[PDB]
Amino acid sequence: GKGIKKHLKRVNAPSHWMLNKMGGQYAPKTSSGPHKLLESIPLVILLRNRLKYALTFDEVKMILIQKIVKVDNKVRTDCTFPVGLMDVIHITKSNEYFRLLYDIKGRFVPHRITNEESKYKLCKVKKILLRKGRLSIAVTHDGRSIPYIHPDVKVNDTVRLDLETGKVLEHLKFQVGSLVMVTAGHSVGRVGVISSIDKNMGTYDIIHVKDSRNKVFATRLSNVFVIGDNTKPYISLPREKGIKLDIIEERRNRLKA
Amino acid sequence: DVQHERAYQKQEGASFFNSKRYWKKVGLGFATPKEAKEGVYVDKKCPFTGNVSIRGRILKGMVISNKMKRTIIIRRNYLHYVKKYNRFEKRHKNIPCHCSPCFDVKEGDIVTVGQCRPLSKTVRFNVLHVEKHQIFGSARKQFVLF
Amino acid sequence: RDGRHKLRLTGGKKKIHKKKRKYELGRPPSNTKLGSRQVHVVRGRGRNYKYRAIKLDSGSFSWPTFGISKNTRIIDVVYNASNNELVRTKTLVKNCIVVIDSHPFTTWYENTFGTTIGKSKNIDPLLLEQFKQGRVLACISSRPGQCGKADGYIIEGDELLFYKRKMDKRN
RNA sequence: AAUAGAUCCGUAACUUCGGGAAAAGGAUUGGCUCUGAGGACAUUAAUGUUAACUCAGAACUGAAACGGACAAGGGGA
RNA sequence: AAAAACCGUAAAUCCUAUCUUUUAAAGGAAGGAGAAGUCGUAACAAGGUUUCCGUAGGUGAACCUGCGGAAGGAUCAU
RNA sequence: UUCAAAGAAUCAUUCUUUUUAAAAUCCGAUUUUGUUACUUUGAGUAAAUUAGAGUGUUCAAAGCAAACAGUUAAAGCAUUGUGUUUGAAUACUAUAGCAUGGAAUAACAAAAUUGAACAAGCU
RNA sequence: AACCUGGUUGAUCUUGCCAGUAGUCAUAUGCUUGUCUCAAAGAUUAAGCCAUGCAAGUGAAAGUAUAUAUAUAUAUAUGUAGAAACUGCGAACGGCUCAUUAAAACAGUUAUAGUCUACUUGACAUUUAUAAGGAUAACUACGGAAAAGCUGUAGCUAAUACUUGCAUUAUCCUUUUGGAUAAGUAUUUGUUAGAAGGAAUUAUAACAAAGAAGUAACACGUAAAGUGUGUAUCAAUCGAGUUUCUGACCUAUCAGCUUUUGAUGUUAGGGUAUUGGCCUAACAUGGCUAUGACGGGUAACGGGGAAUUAGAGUUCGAUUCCGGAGAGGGAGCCUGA
């Protein structure tokens, strides 16, 4: 037969997972769920390769058995669970709170965050659709369906969801002053103010983004996540602050020590 | 008139009893022809009248043959680059396209067509626009950079 | 049972590998006769059920000039644009022309309009002649081998004149 | 003795390119009930009256039989 | 539920035809290779009839002869 | 078929900026003006392999790790303890396809036994 | 490292090949072999044939236990487990091989506004009730056969197996509050109105007909109410099937192919998960080709890649990854997402 494949070879795994060639033949195929396998990491490599809490898959299972870890403040016990582009992880035994972000090299890193910070989730709406009775639902990058969204919300907006109740708090638009984070390209992880939105009829609409240092980079509109307005980002960013530095002069900061 | 042989498409969405002729916009920068807009013909595969939606890619070509009913053969000419000799070579391949009676084509006319769902064994394109063009000699023997 | 084994666009024969897959499938036709209602269940891809109607005698039929639908019974099959063998054997297909009992429609007209929303469409003579005859012409509009029921609509106006001329400069 | 009519298909070596050739060699054929195609004639684009047997296709039917008798090449190297 | 029929999917066997690949064969007729065969002397010197080409006929063999060409000729030339 | 002049900056030159027809937008000044090839930049590019940055596997092939003080604790920070500092870069991913700057070079289009535009009147 | 040398002659300069030279993640083999690291390995020919044994099973709160064993205060209640079996899920992944295959497969690039999609995730539902029915496994007794993962009869019993079946909400208004009005999820047909997309016969809404399947007669227990299992639809996800454009080796001592037998297209239908000559009926005569069609060959799975590279190139890629195909050769089919 030719049903769905259920194995993932290590060298076939996504590169940002950082699975060593010599450390086994297979990679943990993430279970289906909120995020795509390509743009998410499983909990096995979240608690085994990044936090180094576990030394093995069985240890990851031992962690998950005790209902300690929560993803979007609800208990998750699946080892191959997609974490996602941006979302909160709570380790209750060790009290600590993470948000999955991209570093400027496009790799998923758990950003330490505070308990008060760990109630806001930025969800990028992807589809707005009205069902029976003219009720409007927004399907977000996370994969949730939020009904009775505000009519002002558009397709590429972002919403600040309250984790415990799943309700929108405020929405952010996509003006040329709105700061965004890039999601999958060469410039994955950068944060910038949107230079402009070059819209072309029938193909990918391109958007140009200004870094903090006035460096312009363009990207496909699908690879953009509005993170704040022109004042400040609505989330704490990882230590790089979403600024990508030229390889030639990153060496200068590496050498100075 | 509108139908002669045992052939009439319902022209879904035409509406005949209460309502307030059916045509769409196609979009993509193309203008729905006036003959389509105010004509009497009924075509199930017309981009402006039937169910077919134009999506995919848009191409241009010379009309090579219009001898079959409502479909034409479009030859597309292009230059293929041969790396070893660092030069090009003339290459071609003709594609079959549906042609609604709103358009009036002849061999040698230049048409732009848009991809649609497979309508027959070999046709996946509908002519979206025609421009008249005089050809001298065989249309296959013509070569145009489009 | 689909896709391959044909000649290429040029007329050339294609060497075959890739023995038949199940998703090409290709089930045998339903030759829906006219008679007592019996349907069978076909399990298509994804455990989606398709109702293959072996015989139907009644059906939902719509008077479109008034936009209503009433449940009547099919009396006879009189035309179809495809092979004439289908009408001769009285098989129901998606565009078949059938003779439909007019009494539910005439009774509905009596009850709502009186006498023999957006009402008062003024009717035509060519249809009420059939009504007086008691049996009326209708075109099937559903797919009996797919949905398991024969539904249709009364034909009136130019299409009715067309089909009547086709059925009967003529013999 | 073996077929042998007709229809459809297929037809080699060789050749003076005309033939060989009905090469060789396959299939079908009744009855019945139908379907389609092929004309002539008059009226103010439109509707009636009327004629040949000739082809093609389909259902059904039978002790699988149908050029049913008559008539009628054996082919090949 | 056995069983049967009819459309369809259709393995398989047989007959016929065609093609592809390999291979037998009386006889015929080439080529190549043999250290030292017989016959002549064709070519290289004007090679003892200048050589050579196309074509046709003839002869033990090389070859000879006719017609028309070439000089790669033995003439760059009253 | 649209050609030059004037200025700031290295050393004697080179290098950067502006305009100078016409038609539609802005009340002396605010701004678009064939198609393609071609060329420039991008976008989107699985890894392994390859190039290549970092890293003393005792060297090397390698691997993607690792490094830092601690004969037995200071520091950082936490309002009493909690290790800390990192990397796993970049490039390539056809010739085809998407977007894009374009002056040259090439084609095609339009161009008269004639074809336009403007003003006024008429529909 | 952008390299040449011996060989025609009495000697010379050429052309020109032969030979030499070096590499090969390129195989075999000869001789030899003290360490350590590292690691290809029945592809080549025979996708030839196979003895044997293993390779897919699964119960730690959560379907069903009087097989049975045990333990706590007094024949009771809690239990702890549990052979077997029924039920559920998986066995369609993985692993192997490269025979087939030459615009096919594959690659990059699109479309699915032409579709299906289990597990998982998010939303969230409509036309006897202090809890309904028979019937079966395991089991018991009697057997048959040389043999098999064979099973007959009779009797019992459950289940989240199989099958029946038990409130309510929304809208109009005097206007917190009172009366009035109405009740089918997908899917199919007819008549209509019309957040987004590039374009809608879109979402959705109204009217008229049909109408699946369901909305818990099910199990265990966390804060000093929870989970499991099952379920209608939508969405997401893990995928799949089709699909656009472009890209392949040798051969013309393969030049015309295809078209009754579907070839090219129109119309109608059938079929499909969906589009489509995919199939059927009628109709028209189309479609491809010296820019190589149709054929033939390949000791041809395609690509990522490998060797050799100054630059161009030439040759290889059965084989770690991806895609395809196959399970002695064909064909057919059940279960099932």
CSV table of C-alpha atoms (C1' of nucleotides) in Angstrom, one decimal, chain A residues 11-12 15 18 20-22 105 107 184-186 200 203 206 218-220 223 239 244 247 251 254, chain F residues 42-49 53-54 62-65 85-90 93 97-99:
chain,number,residue,atom,x,y,z
A,11,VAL,CA,19.3,13.9,7.2
A,12,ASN,CA,15.8,14.4,5.8
A,15,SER,CA,17.9,21.7,9.1
A,18,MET,CA,20.0,20.5,14.2
A,20,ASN,CA,23.6,15.4,14.2
A,21,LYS,CA,24.3,13.0,11.3
A,22,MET,CA,25.9,10.3,13.4
A,105,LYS,CA,19.7,32.5,11.9
A,107,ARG,CA,16.3,28.5,14.4
A,184,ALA,CA,10.7,31.3,6.6
A,185,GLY,CA,13.0,33.0,4.1
A,186,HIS,CA,16.7,33.9,3.7
A,200,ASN,CA,1.1,42.0,-7.9
A,203,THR,CA,1.3,35.9,-7.9
A,206,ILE,CA,6.1,41.0,-2.0
A,218,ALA,CA,12.1,42.0,0.7
A,219,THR,CA,10.0,38.8,1.4
A,220,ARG,CA,6.9,36.9,0.4
A,223,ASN,CA,6.5,34.9,5.5
A,239,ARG,CA,18.9,38.6,22.7
A,244,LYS,CA,20.8,40.4,11.4
A,247,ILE,CA,28.9,37.9,8.4
A,251,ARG,CA,33.5,38.1,13.2
A,254,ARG,CA,33.2,37.3,18.0
F,42,G,C1',15.9,40.1,-5.3
F,43,A,C1',12.1,36.5,-3.7
F,44,G,C1',11.3,30.9,-3.0
F,45,U,C1',15.2,27.3,-2.7
F,46,A,C1',15.8,19.8,2.1
F,47,A,C1',19.6,17.7,3.9
F,48,A,C1',23.8,14.4,2.8
F,49,U,C1',27.9,15.8,-0.7
F,53,A,C1',33.3,30.7,8.8
F,54,G,C1',34.3,28.7,14.0
F,62,A,C1',36.9,13.4,11.2
F,63,G,C1',32.7,15.3,14.2
F,64,C,C1',29.4,19.4,15.5
F,65,A,C1',30.9,20.1,19.1
F,85,U,C1',29.7,31.9,28.1
F,86,U,C1',28.7,29.9,23.2
F,87,G,C1',28.3,27.4,18.0
F,88,A,C1',25.8,24.4,14.8
F,89,A,C1',27.2,30.5,10.1
F,90,U,C1',27.3,32.0,4.7
F,93,U,C1',20.6,24.8,-5.6
F,97,G,C1',9.1,29.8,-13.8
F,98,C,C1',7.7,34.9,-10.1
F,99,A,C1',9.3,40.1,-9.0
